Homo-oligomer: A and B are copies of this chain.
């Protein structure tokens, strides 16, 4: 593949609205996308106040790092809120979702193997 290094302010990427049957009040920035990533992609998600990523699962893992705010994590059984400075590992096929119960934006980094897209 190519050489070099990219160094960029994440906020220089516009936050794009995610709207699907199971996601509302969420925006995403693709930081290191399919066009460049050899193995895995880096996204920055913004959950607006009251935003929801419904419980779901997929046949790849998630690696998450919470950057800002209080993120409510939905589990197969119940939920738990974590804050900036927490990491999350979600196994392949594990049920998970997210909610923002606060009045400010919540941000988290989310990385997946590139076979799951960007």
Inter-chain contacts of A10 with B (CB < 8 A) = 65, 85-87
Inter-chain contacts of A61 with B (CB < 8 A) = 37-39
- Among A7, A38, A90, max chain B CB count under 10 A is at A7
* Closest residue of B by beta carbon distance from A40: B40
Q: CB-CB contacts of A74-91 with B at 8 A, as 1s and 0s? A: 010000101001111111
Q: How far is the CB of A52 from chain B (nearest CB, A)?
A: 18
**Contacting pair A63 B32 (CB below 8 A):** yes
Inter-chain contacts of A94 with B (CB < 8 A) = 3-5
Q: How far is the CB of A84 from chain B (nearest CB, A)?
A: 9
Q: How far is the CB of A54 from chain B (nearest CB, A)?
A: 16
